[PDB]
Structure formats: structure tokens, C-alpha cells
Amino acid sequence: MTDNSNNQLVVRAKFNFQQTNEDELSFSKGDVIHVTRVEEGGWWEGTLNGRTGWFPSNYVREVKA
């Protein structure tokens, strides 16, 4: 509404990634994740249904419908 503008960066899971705790974000081929902090190459943080935490940028790719 305020911070989120100029089209949000949407990313889609590539490979089946496994989490370790509620601190890390889990995702499987298909589950979409909304980025909240996108840096210049590295680790990206996002949110998912019942799953919230950090996620790699190499196992995910910027998706756009």
C-alpha cells in the first residue's frame, strides 16, 4: 500500500527445498513466495502459507504471470 509499489517482485520455487525449523521457509516446485527483502544476489526473505523465513535465490526464479 505504501512501501509495496512499482509492481512487487514475485518468485516461484524451482526445486523441492527442505526446511529445518519454523525459522526457515520451506517450498516445493510450485509454491509461490512473496519477496519482502530482495538484495543484490544472495539470500532473499519472503512469506508463505504457514511458512515464513529466508530462502535461497539459486533455487528460486523470478516468476511473472
Binding site: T20, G41, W44, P56, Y59
Partner: peptide, 22 residues
């Protein structure tokens, strides 16, 4: 399709890594 050799984002000894991750 072409899979990239570099798997998972890089994780140095500094900057990243917080409260230990797995």
C-alpha cells in the same frame, strides 16, 4: 531446460548467517 551448476545461494563466513541456519 538447463540446470545451473551453482546450487543454493552463497553463504560466506560474514554478512549472511544469523543465529545459525540449516
Amino acid at each position: 531446460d538447463a540446470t545451473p551448476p551453482p546450487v543454493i545461494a552463497p553463504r560466506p563466513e560474514h554478512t549472511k548467517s544469523v543465529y545459525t541456519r540449516s
